[PDB]
Design a protein around this ligand. Structure first.
Ligand SMILES: COc1cc(N2CCC(O)CC2)ccc1Nc1cc(Nc2ccccc2S(=O)(=O)C(C)C)c2cc[nH]c2n1
Length: 253
């Protein structure tokens, strides 16, 4: 019921989707009555290291615009010493809400979301970025299509690769492990160590090879292979994003 200006342009605030320290996202309308998400970050108690981290993520989001529509759109931003305003594409729902509120998934819809996850992450990898904290909440469904919102620059432990737990040690392969965990959720309705009540017992489970990960028989033997390949505990043995892109699973239907 109130307004904002970003680079000379006024936006009407429909509602706030999300709050935080010290940042917020509002769903907003421009003068053409087009819809956007505007993130606002308050820098009042933000330190130089923090500030640079933010400037860096903003820089890369802006660059990778050109290179793939599987990264969230940034149309504009206004940045001063007190705040940031980012004028971005508005999502329909984040992947995690979407999976939390889904009772199963269309095999095709899943395959199509995988293609998207791989394309976003493939991109950032091509520019030297390793997200290294990939979750469903890092993805947005926009008009049937999955988009990556964040680059890791600016549950928790479920999607964590074992090389982060033993940690000198982080490679693009760590992202593949984490994607692996997402698909697994989308295939089996849970992450690989979600059974493990206790969070230390989990951490030993994630890194211990005497712990066979289970992969129940399912109609799509390809999906089973992809999962078996991403979730190999040794990154050197694990599969690469560009290999995953040529795999029968994403290539044949
Ligand atoms: C109506 O627009 C939205 C609605 C929702 N939900 C609908 C309500 C609830 O049931 C589940 C989440 C979730 C996301 C959006 N759209 C968003 C959310 C965004 N981020 C966001 C918003 C609120 C809370 C958290 C985030 S997030 O960046 O941390 C991530 C979880 C999307 C962004 C960022 C850029 N564009 C965006 N579009």
């Amino acid at each position: 019921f109130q307004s904002m200006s970003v680079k000379g342009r006024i936006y009407s605030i429909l509602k706030q989707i999300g709050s935080g320290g010290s940042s917020k996202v509002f769903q907003v309308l421009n003068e053409k009555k087009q819809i956007y998400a505007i993130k606002y970050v308050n820098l009042e108690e933000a330190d130089n290291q923090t500030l640079d981290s933010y400037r860096n993520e903003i820089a890369y989001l802006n660059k990778l615009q050109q290179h793939s529509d599987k990264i969230i759109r940034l149309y504009d931003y206004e940045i001063t010493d007190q705040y940031i305003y980012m004028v971005m594409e508005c999502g329909n729902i984040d992947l995690n809400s979407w999976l939390k509120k889904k009772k199963s998934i269309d095999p095709w819809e899943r395959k199509s979301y995988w293609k998207n996850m791989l394309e976003a992450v493939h991109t950032i990898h091509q520019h030297g970025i390793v997200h290294s904290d990939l979750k469903p909440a890092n993805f947005l469904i926009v008009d049937g299509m999955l988009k990556l919102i964040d680059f890791g620059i600016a549950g928790t432990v479920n999607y964590m690769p074992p090389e982060a737990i033993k940690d000198s040690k982080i490679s693009p392969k760590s992202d593949v492990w984490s994607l692996g965990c997402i698909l697994y959720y989308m295939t089996y309705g849970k992450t690989p160590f979600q059974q493990i009540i206790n969070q230390i017992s989990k951490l030993h489970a994630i890194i211990d090879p005497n712990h066979e990960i289970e992969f129940p028989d399912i109609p799509e033997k390809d999906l089973q292979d992809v999962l078996k390949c991403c979730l190999k505990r040794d990154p050197k043995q694990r599969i690469s994003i560009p290999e995953l892109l040529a795999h029968p699973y994403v290539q044949i239907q």
